[PDB]
Amino acid sequence: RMDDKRFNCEKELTLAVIGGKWKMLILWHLGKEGTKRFNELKTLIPDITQKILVNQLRELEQDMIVHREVYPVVPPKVEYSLTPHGESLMPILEAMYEWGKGYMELIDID
Amino acid sequence: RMDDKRFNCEKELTLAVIGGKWKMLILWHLGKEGTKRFNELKTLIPDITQKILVNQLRELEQDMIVHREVYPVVPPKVEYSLTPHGESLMPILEAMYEWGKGYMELIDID
């Protein structure tokens, strides 16, 4: 049957949502730390630039992975969190991390 | 600390081992079905060509993901299976598949 083409597309889709080097970092910290403000992510990933960070958060919110919420307190608070889909994505990223550690260990200690 | 750069490299390493459209298919069938002969993979992924399939299996065996074993019976049998690392990689691929299904459902039924 056509079970390969759909397996490929549905695994590829997850890869694109993960994308390049920046999206998975933002998710990782939101998953472990919880809600964070823009400044806080900016400093938890000091390698990231201001312009890149707003672009990645914007794609992630349109991709319904990251939720933005504004609390009109004094002064107002705008904080970022994971959509339920983002949370269901966290185990995968932790699994990939753990496998990378064990495989890098393997490569290193032949 | 430098916890991002190592998280990135160790997640990237897993992505490279997964690589493009062919390596994850071969693993998937070996994980679910078990040991398979070359012909059998060739037919379980009919889209693959002979030349591509031997290249991907060769990278996967050098990457210590796929194990090749020869049984000198009559006539001899050469069969492919997953190294323990390949088996520890299967849950990740099943998780990515399940997340892709639910996220594609989401995209589709807004």
Residue numbers in the entry:
A (entry chain A), B (entry chain A): 3 to 112
Source paper text:
The crystal structure of wild-type HxlR without DNA and FA treatment (HxlR-WT) was also solved to 2.6-Å resolution. Both FA-treated and -untreated HxlR adopt an overall topology similar to the previously reported MarR/DUF24 family proteins that bind DNA in a dimeric form, with each monomer consisting of dimerization domain (helices α1 and α5) and winged helix-turn-helix (wHTH) DNA-binding domain (helices α2, α3, α4, and β-strands). Our study on the FA-sensing transcription factor HxlR revealed that FA induced a specific intrahelical crosslinking reaction between residues Cys11 and Lys13. The resulting methylene bridge (Cys-CH2-Lys) on HxlR’s helix α1 caused unwinding and rotation of its N-terminus (“N-terminal helix-flipping”) that allosterically rotated its DNA-binding domain with enhanced DNA affinity and transcriptional activation. Taken together, we confirmed that HxlR uses a gain-of-function, intrahelical crosslinking mechanism between its N-terminal residues Cys11 and Lys13 to sense FA and trigger the transcriptional responses.
The distance between the DNA-binding helices α4 and α4′ were 34.8 Å in HxlR-WT-FA-DNA and 44.0 Å in HxlR-WT, consistent with the DNA-bound and non-DNA-bound forms of MarR/DUF24 family proteins, respectively. Interestingly, a covalent bridge was clearly visible between the side-chains of Cys11 and Lys13 on the 2Fo-Fc electron density map of the HxlR-WT-FA-DNA structure, while the side-chains of Cys11 and Lys13 were located oppositely in helix α1 and their side-chains were separated 9.6 Å away from each other in the HxlR-WT structure. When the dimeric form of HxlR-WT-FA-DNA and HxlR-WT were superimposed on one monomer, the non-superimposed subunits showed a large conformational change, with the wHTH domain rotated 21.9 degree and tips of the β-wings translocated 24.6 Å. It is noteworthy that although the superimposed subunits of HxlR-WT-FA-DNA and HxlR-WT fit close to each other (r.m.s.d. = 0.595 Å for 82 Cα atoms), an obvious difference was observed on the N-terminal residues. Whereas the N-terminal residues formed an intact helix α1 in the HxlR-WT structure, this helix breaks at Cys11 in HxlR-WT-FA-DNA, with residues before Cys11 becoming unstructured.
